[PDB]
Amino acid sequence: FQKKRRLEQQLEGQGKAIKGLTSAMGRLHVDLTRVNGLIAANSAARQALA
Amino acid sequence: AAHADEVFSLENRKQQLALSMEERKQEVEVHRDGLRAELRLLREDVHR
What we know:
With 50 residues, chain A is an all-alpha fold. Helices cover 96% and strands 0% of the residues of chain A.
């Protein structure tokens, strides 16, 4: 029973790690979109200034 | 970052061009004013 409980605890730990990694992936995807938008805006600004 | 550096450099060059133009334009303005003063003094002398 001690072994089973310990294995369970490891299971919930891994599940929590998975969920945290997915949240980080979502945040990084949003930042991807924002950064690409900034890329486009500054490219247009560069052409205008030239 | 590269794009921002290019844009920043272009803005600096634009503003520096504008200010140097303002300076040089004033310089030619005062030079032409001196030429005009010489002109009018010459006209009054030649009329007399």
